[PDB]
Write a protein that binds this ligand. Structure first.
Ligand SMILES: CCCCCCCCCCCCCCCCCC(=O)OC[C@H](COP(=O)([O-])OCC(O)COP(=O)([O-])OC[C@@H](COC(=O)CCCCCCCCCCCCCCCCC)OC(=O)CCCCCCCCCCCCCCCCC)OC(=O)CCCCCCCCCCCCCCCCC
Ligand code: SF4
Ligand code: SF4
Ligand code: SF4
Ligand code: SF4
Ligand code: FES
Ligand SMILES: [Mg+2]
Ligand SMILES: [Zn+2]
Lengths: 176, 96, 125, 208, 97, 112, 379, 230, 115, 29, 48
């Protein structure tokens, strides 16, 4: 089915013509628009007083990255390199080697946050929940170099945000 | 357990530290070097060895679906302790 | 209507390649060898044209691997050897071709394992 | 056929096959092949000299009247003698149908421009010249449409490097933006993802 | 909205419609930010038997396109690509604006 | 009669039956010069004969619109003009001749 | 007759004026050509999906849906019913977002600028649904070639219903501002008139067709997901000018609200992606407890799925018109070719004809009524 | 000559007498799935992955071991052979460990690729898997026998190609294990090749451990210069 | 055989004529461009650059390649006439900011591994 | 054990949603 | 908290006068909220 938007034929009797003439000469529709704007002036604005109020977010929200670790305190990353392979922007660089105890661990784990597109593919290709994209979004920088994260920076981010990262993963892991 | 380099720098958990003659140290002067204080190797070294009376044990890292893929560890070799490939936890049969 | 010209094709002047990346590069036309880690043979069917390796160095910051040539990741696929050679000549690249290696057929027989007097007698199975 | 498999339509398959045979019968001078996809898509392969006639027929015939040009693109296959593959996608509103016409060319042989048939082709053809280097004859204004002014090379050819040959920066010595040979701090990592153990026996090729 | 009755009357008269019925600012009428756990049922091929994969594989049922009149190899009524599209109806819900 | 066909730029054609008859006669006249065994000739002859029979058999315009399956008879005149122009163009082109030449060996071989 | 250059979406426009009139208009594009189609050839299909959010960055999920439909057609699979209903729901939400963008920015360029804020509040709300359903406000990448990435959180449908029940008065306030205003009419009435034959020949689609009286719509004529199971009307213009297209877009907003209500009421239960773990990854629990699931997760997130060889052209009725993709697969996990057809290309091509004998200020109105986003134009 | 005519999926091919079904399928152009068959080793017929259907024959035959005779039609894509492949892969994967992320043979595993192509996509195994203790056969080959699929390919290579008979099978049934049965190091100049023949990550390269993934690496074809063999 | 479809010319004489036409057009345009874009080069230097750009393709013997090159050259000439190009684009022909790459064997041996 | 719980419309569906244009007339000749 | 206000303004924070090492009487920013209060403040949960 279909509708017509502008095939309305105005009436040509004296009353309709007089109404149109009064509309032209007295500016009724312009005053009607003025009334609409005046009505909108007297209602509460939609502004929040940043940085004291914050916009609503959800557990699925993905911001700054972090590297997590087990409750024992030993890092979850096993250098499987699936996050590096799935990364659409090639923003992850990984190097691994056997540790002193023979553990399969990364000796280099860099994310270029100027190349990252924050798609979350890395945190969903990870089998051990090591790389996550946490809820932080206020990490603006004064230089380009500090947006080039290494393993220590991501580990510190994980240690810093683990509380609400784990809370969000608990809230959302049944949908994954 | 964070060690300090002979120059004075902090050595990361990977054993990285610029030596005396490396110029790149200039990037840290008037700034700081980011080193994580928590070393996973030391933290996993202090874990107790779990005692189970079964020849084969299962480990999923704790948390169920929030851990790592489930694996099965053999404990027949009484010389050493069975180690999870993912978690790094240790298991061992009750000898004597 | 037809020029009927008699000259070898050469589109070098129309591709926009810099002059140094034409007379100095050396393409290799080959069938890639089977990965001995696997027994599948589906990656040894087509011909490949690839350029020679140039210098890669370590980035002073972040220690990444930096390069300077544009043709490092360029690999072309061709149905036959002649098509690849024609493409290389048309584009003005010096090429090296080595012939396809096919595994020769072998006489396999299970019954040779259990031999009465020959040495093909297997110790276990 | 379970809910995990896309269902087949046979009525449209037969209709498209019949219409393809019809177009083949009407225009035997140019049509070289006609195919219908398993998902009911009809494509016609013609000689390059028949671009203007065939398209015109498809635009003007009462049974066809493919009045709309959805898209015009080119596909680069370096292993073919005729490198470039020109594809015309047409839509018929009167019969609620779609058709595809396919043609071949190379670096030096030009293609007649279909601006006289479809005006929409104009910009499309320009893009092809910009991206593949295919020349279109009798074009109102053929020039680059997407690349930078003075850009050397056609980037959508399969042998053009992904990162190009030059990169732009600003120089304070000359107080202007300059172009220099490209140097990447991190080279593009090339991943070999093709696996052995072919997936689809339906597309197997003879071992020559 | 915690607006005085006189201001509500003024805004409603100026706009010409009742604003308090449908406010554009969200209030306690929205859903709670903490929710119960879900269950998310399984798909149809989660059976334990009569579930062989060869019987439910779409990709391997794809076939190369069928060729008609490979040129290298009767009344005959004319045909069309498809039956002509039938004329649309005039929306007997609001045919005209 | 009606007004404002609904398509922008398409005018209302008073007395469309005469226009249709003239256009179909012109189409048949142009088709006459095409070789008899050409497929385009026979197909377009059949189409034009069917449409001319339908238009001579219905004095109404609404019922003719319903029967012709094109709708908006003015569009039928437009399509008749397009078909006439195509007929002249194809008489010039002569597309009933055999194929110009076969493509190279693996021109349409996909994959590779 | 002087030639002047309106230089730095971002557009360069070369125009010759004979006094107030415009004689020749020449858009110079390519200022946002990133080489997306070439970069897609170096990615797998899942890796190539996020490019389509950035193609038309005002209607993201519609590009996702078009790409997913093309890949589904090539793969010979179909999504589950709940996935299709979610896809149509979020496509209508995306249509609302795009039409708000188009109308408000058109009016802003004209000089109104109040409906911009009035309706960007609702745009922010719609953004929350995207954020809640996927975790990203704009480039969600939610719709996947097998269905959708994740299921709806338990409170989403109620909030969607509560938002959609108050949107009609927002459209009504917009219409009070613009529809009957005489200045808006004099700015848009009888401007950029294009005839049906010329619009059809030049490759126009969407409102550019519907505004000229052509009764065409891909959701009705060639329905794709569940659009044949919903009822809505298709507004049709009469004069082919900017005012008719503005009315058509507003009525599309209303019809999108109608479809949103229907989609909310008829949401079915079930899974969200094709239950074929060789195309869609298994659940995290299944991957962490089963061996086949782990192997399939590994292979899908490292190499990807192999698509059978073939070429398709799949088009959908995006809010800007017919948006299509010509996808060519050589039989691997990496697409051989991905041509992207956006209606903005043809519309900006027709700009030159659309602005014959008009004022300099009318060119802004014509560009606005074409709703040209240069991400899809340049690609 | 003395060639016999057989058919593969209805396509004729002339093969020498004594040729197996697998080789005839190779000649036509198809690669039969395999785990225990190696063209350089003797035939074992263990894994049963190469089971293919002969037309008008009620039982599937092992392609790697069954010589072909005149007049057979080999039906490689029949429903029977596909179901055989699916069942065999299910049995192979029933006791395999979930070690793919930590396995050095992630993107270059025959078990993974053949499970993706010729197997199903889900499991109906609701039991507990088995686990065996790792052996220690030297510093060159890293041994994780929990990933072993008992194809006895390393045993055949060691016994025949390397002439070294220390590898073998100890035990019976499901708890049968591959090894030396004693603390012994498998030392030979050809000892590294057991890494290559092993389709799974049971035997891997210890100096290469955890270093890289196959898709990252670039392959350059070159020549050995450690000796005069070249 | 070796018979092909022409573009503009049938043999080398017509292609040479078109090359001469394009050279005349560029030669007449050089000083107008130098003045209009407010260049730092002289007219002699610009015409020398035009001569060098022409001499770069002096080894072509295919009329199709030659006239396609001529088509391209008219395209950049049209870009330059209408001032589509900025000041930076005109310079891109001179490589003023690039270091001089030596050609002798010893210099290349010393600087790097590049052959 | 547990029964399936996912986002669904409530029993009986949702309430009607107004979508028609509503432009009132103030009224004066 | 004030549940009578509309969504967005129903929760807020008054920042401290002196954080770790500077005087933040005037220099405040959204990065001073600890992660648990970050989760509560951004309405990712209803439970402080
Ligand atoms: C005209 C004279 C001005 C009177 C006036 O503005 O009263 C607003 C008063 C409140 O109307 P409202 O905006 O709908 O109610 C908002 C809340 O009640 C607002 O209630 P609240 O809980 O947010 O209290 C905030 C309080 C204090 O808030 C402030 O600190 C701002 C006051 C500083 C004003 C300088 O505001 C006031 O009491 C002062 C209002 C302005 C008088 C000066 O409206 C009237 O009294 C009707 C006057 C009719 C004018 C047409
Ligand atoms: S979020 Fe996406 S782009 Fe960023 S690192 Fe992860 S995979 Fe790469
Ligand atoms: S972060 Fe996860 S996916 Fe990436 S290498 Fe570590 S374990 Fe593998
Ligand atoms: S051997 Fe293969 S299937 Fe087994 S864990 Fe290793 S990679 Fe995975
Ligand atoms: S160790 Fe490897 S090669 Fe040896 S039997 Fe086991 S799977 Fe086969
Ligand atoms: S390959 Fe034939 S049974 Fe193993
Ligand atoms: Mg191995
Ligand atoms: Zn563990």
């Amino acid at each position: 089915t279909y509708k017509f938007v502008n095939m309305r034929e105005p009436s040509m009797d004296m009353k309709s013509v007089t109404d149109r003439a009064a509309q032209t000469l007295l500016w009724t529709e312009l005053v009607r628009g003025l009334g609409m704007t005046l009505s909108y002036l007297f209602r509460e604005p939609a502004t929040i007083n940043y940085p004291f109020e914050k916009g609503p977010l959800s557990p699925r929200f993905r911001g700054e990255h972090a590297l997590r670790r087990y409750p024992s305190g030993e890092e979850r990353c096993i250098a499987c390199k699936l996050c590096e392979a799935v990364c659409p922007a090639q923003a992850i660089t990984i190097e691994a080697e056997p540790r002193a105890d023979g553990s399969r661990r990364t000796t280099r784990y860099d994310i270029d946050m100027t190349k990252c597109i924050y798609c979350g593919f890395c945190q969903e290709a990870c089998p051990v929940d090591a790389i996550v994209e946490g809820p932080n979004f206020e990490f603006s920088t004064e230089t380009h170099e500090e947006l080039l994260y290494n393993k220590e920076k991501l580990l510190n981010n994980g240690d810093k945000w683990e509380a609400e990262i784990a809370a969000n993963i608990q809230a959302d892991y049944l949908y994954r | 357990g964070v060690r300090t380099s002979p120059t004075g720098e902090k050595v990361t958990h990977t054993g990285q530290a610029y030596d005396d003659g490396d110029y790149r140290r200039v990037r840290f002067s008037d700034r700081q070097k980011e080193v994580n204080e928590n070393f996973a190797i030391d933290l996993i070294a202090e874990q107790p060895v779990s005692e189970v009376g079964s020849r084969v044990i299962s480990c999923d890292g704790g948390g169920g679906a929030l851990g790592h893929p489930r694996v099965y560890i053999n404990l027949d070799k009484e010389t050493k302790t069975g180690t999870c490939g993912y978690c790094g936890l240790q298991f061992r049969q009750p000898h004597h | 209507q037809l020029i009927a010209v008699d000259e070898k094709l050469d589109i070098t002047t129309l591709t926009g390649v810099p002059e140094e990346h034409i007379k100095t590069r050396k393409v290799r036309i080959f069938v890639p060898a089977r990965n001995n880690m696997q027994s599948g043979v589906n990656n040894t069917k087509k011909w490949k044209m690839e350029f020679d390796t140039r210098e890669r160095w370590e980035n002073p910051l972040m220690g990444w691997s930096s390069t300077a040539d544009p043709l490092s990741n360029l690999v072309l696929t061709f149905s036959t050897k002649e098509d690849a050679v024609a493409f290389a000549e048309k584009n003005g690249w010096s090429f090296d071709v080595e012939e396809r290696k096919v595994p020769k057929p072998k006489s396999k027989s299970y019954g040779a394992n259990f031999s009465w007097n020959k040495r093909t007698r297997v110790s276990t199975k | 056929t379970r809910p995990t498999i896309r269902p087949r339509n046979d009525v449209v398959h037969k209709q498209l096959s019949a219409f393809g045979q019809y177009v083949a019968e009407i225009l035997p001078k140019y049509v070289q092949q006609v195919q219908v996809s398993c998902f009911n898509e009809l494509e016609i392969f013609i000689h390059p000299d028949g671009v203007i006639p065939v398209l015109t027929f498809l635009r003007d015939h009462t049974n066809a009247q493919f009045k709309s040009l959805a898209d015009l693109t080119a596909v680069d296959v370096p292993t073919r003698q005729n490198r470039f593959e020109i594809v015309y996608n047409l839509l018929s509103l009167r019969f609620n149908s779609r058709i595809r016409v396919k043609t071949y060319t190379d670096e030096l042989t030009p293609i007649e421009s279909s601006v006289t048939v479809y005006k929409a082709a104009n910009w499309y053809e320009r893009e092809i010249w910009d991206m593949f280097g295919v020349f279109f004859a009798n074009h109102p204004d053929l020039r680059r449409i997407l690349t930078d002014y003075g850009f050397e090379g056609h980037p959508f050819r399969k042998d053009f490097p992904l990162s190009g040959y030059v990169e732009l920066r600003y120089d304070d010595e000359v107080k202007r933006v300059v172009a220099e040979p490209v140097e990447l701090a991190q080279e593009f990592r090339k991943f070999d993802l093709n696996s052995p153990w072919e997936a689809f026996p339906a597309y197997r090729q003879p071992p020559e | 909205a915690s607006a005085t009755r006189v201001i509500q009357l003024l805004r409603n008269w100026a706009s010409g419609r009742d604003l308090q019925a449908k406010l554009q600012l969200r209030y306690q009428e929205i859903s709670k930010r903490t929710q119960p756990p879900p269950k998310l049922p399984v798909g149809p091929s989660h059976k334990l038997s009569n579930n062989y994969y060869c019987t439910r594989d779409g990709r391997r049922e794809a076939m190369p396109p069928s060729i008609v009149m490979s040129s290298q190899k009767t009344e005959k009524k004319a045909v069309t690509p498809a039956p002509p599209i039938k004329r649309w109806e005039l929306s007997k819900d609001q045919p005209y604006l | 009669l009606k007004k404002t066909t609904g398509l922008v730029g398409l005018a209302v054609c008073e007395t469309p039956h005469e226009r249709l008859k003239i256009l179909y006669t012109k189409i048949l006249d142009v088709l006459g010069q095409i070789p008899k065994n050409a497929a385009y000739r026979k197909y377009t002859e059949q189409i034009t004969n069917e449409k001319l029979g339908m238009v001579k058999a219905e004095p109404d315009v609404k019922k003719l619109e319903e029967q012709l399956q094109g709708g908006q008879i003015e569009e039928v005149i437009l399509q008749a003009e397009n078909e006439l122009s195509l007929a002249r163009k194809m008489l010039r082109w002569k597309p009933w001749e055999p194929l110009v030449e076969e493509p190279p060996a693996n021109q349409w071989k996909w994959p590779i | 007759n002087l030639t002047l250059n309106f230089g730095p979406g971002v557009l360069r426009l070369v125009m010759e004026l004979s006094g107030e009139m415009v004689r020749k208009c020449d858009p110079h594009i390519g200022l946002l050509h990133r080489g997306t189609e070439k970069l897609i050839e170096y990615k797998t299909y899942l890796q190539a999906l996020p490019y389509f959010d950035r193609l038309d960055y005002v209607s993201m999920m519609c590009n996702e849906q078009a790409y997913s439909l093309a890949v589904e057609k090539l793969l010979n699979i179909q999504p589950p019913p709940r996935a299709q209903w979610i896809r149509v729901l979020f496509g209508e939400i995306t249509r609302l977002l795009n039409h708000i963008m188009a109308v408000t920015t058109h009016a802003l360029d004209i000089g109104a600028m109040t409906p911009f804020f009035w309706m960007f509040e609702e745009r922010e709300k719609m953004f929350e649904f995207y954020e809640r359903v996927s975790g990203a406000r704009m480039h969600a990448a939610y719709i996947r070639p097998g269905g959708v990435h994740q299921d709806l959180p338990l409170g989403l449908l109620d909030d969607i219903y509560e938002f959609s029940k108050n949107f009609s008065f927002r459209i009504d306030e917009l219409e009070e501002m613009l529809t009957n205003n005489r200045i808006w009419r004099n700015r848009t009435v009888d401007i950029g008139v294009v005839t049906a034959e010329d619009a059809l020949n030049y490759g126009f689609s969407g409102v550019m067709l519907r505004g000229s009286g052509i009764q065409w719509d891909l959701r009705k004529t060639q329905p794709y997901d569940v659009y044949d199971q919903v009822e809505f009307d298709v507004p049709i213009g009469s004069r082919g000018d900017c005012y008719d297209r503005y009315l058509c877009r507003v009525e599309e907003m209303r019809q999108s609200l109608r479809i949103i209500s229907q989609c909310l009421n008829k949401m079915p239960p079930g899974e969200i992606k094709v239950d074929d773990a060789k195309v869609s990854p298994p659940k995290r629990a299944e991957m962490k407890t089963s061996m086949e699931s782990l192997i399939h997760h590994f292979k899908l997130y490292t190499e990807g799925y192999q698509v059978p060889p073939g070429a398709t052209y799949t088009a959908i009725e995006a809010p800007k018109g017919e948006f299509g993709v010509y996808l060519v697969s050589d039989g691997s996990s990496r697409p051989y070719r991905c041509k992207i057809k956006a209606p903005g290309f043809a519309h900006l091509a027709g700009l030159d004809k659309m602005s014959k004998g008009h004022m300099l200020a009318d060119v802004v109105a014509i560009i606005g009524t074409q709703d040209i986003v240069f991400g899809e134009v340049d690609r | 000559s003395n060639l016999i005519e057989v058919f593969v999926d209805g396509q004729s091919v002339m093969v020498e007498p004594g040729t197996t079904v697998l080789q005839a399928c190779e000649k036509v152009g198809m690669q039969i799935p395999r785990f225990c068959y190696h063209e350089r080793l003797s035939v074992a017929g263990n894994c049963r992955m190469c089971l293919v259907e002969i037309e008008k024959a009620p039982k599937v035959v092992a392609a790697c071991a069954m010589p072909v005779m005149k007049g057979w039609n080999i039906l490689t894509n029949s429903e029977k052979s596909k179901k055989a492949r699916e069942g065999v892969m299910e049995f192979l994967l029933a006791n395999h460990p979930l070690d793919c992320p930590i396995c050095d043979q992630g993107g270059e595993c025959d078990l993974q690729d053949q499970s993706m192509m010729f197997g199903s996509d889900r499991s109906r195994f609701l039991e507990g898997k088995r686990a065996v203790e790792d052996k220690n056969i030297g510093p060159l080959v890293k041994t994780i026998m929990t990933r072993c699929i008992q194809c006895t390919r390393c045993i055949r290579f060691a016994s025949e190609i390397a002439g070294v008979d220390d590898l073998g099978t100890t035990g019976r049934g499901n708890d049968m294990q591959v090894g030396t049965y004693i603390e012994k190091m498998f030392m030979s100049e050809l000892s590294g090749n057991i890494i290559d023949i092993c389709p799974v990550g049971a035997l891997t390269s210890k100096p290469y451990a955890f270093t890289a993934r196959p898709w990252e690496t670039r392959k350059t074809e070159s020549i050995d210069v450690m000796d005069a063999v070249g | 055989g070796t018979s092909v479809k022409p573009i503009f010319s049938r043999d080398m004489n017509e292609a040479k004529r078109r090359v001469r036409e394009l050279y005349r057009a560029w030669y007449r345009e050089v000083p107008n461009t130098v003045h209009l874009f407010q260049l730092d080069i002289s007219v002699k230097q610009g015409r020398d650059k035009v001569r060098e750009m022409f001499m770069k393709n002096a080894h072509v013997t295919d009329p199709r390649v030659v006239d396609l090159l001529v088509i391209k050259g008219k395209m950049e000439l049209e870009e330059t006439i209408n001032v589509w190009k900025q000041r930076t684009h005109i310079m891109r022909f001179f490589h003023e900011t690039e270091a001089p790459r030596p050609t002798d064997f010893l210099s290349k041996f010393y600087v790097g591994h590049d052959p | 054990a547990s029964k399936v719980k996912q986002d669904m419309p409530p029993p009986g569906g949702y309430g009607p949603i107004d979508y028609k244009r509503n432009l009132p007339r103030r009224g004066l000749s | 908290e004030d549940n009578k206000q509309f969504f967005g303004r129903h929760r807020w924070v008054i920042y401290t006068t002196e954080m770790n090492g500077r005087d933040t009487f005037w220099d405040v920013d959204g990065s001073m909220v600890p992660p648990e209060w970050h989760r509560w403040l951004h309405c990712m949960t209803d439970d402080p």
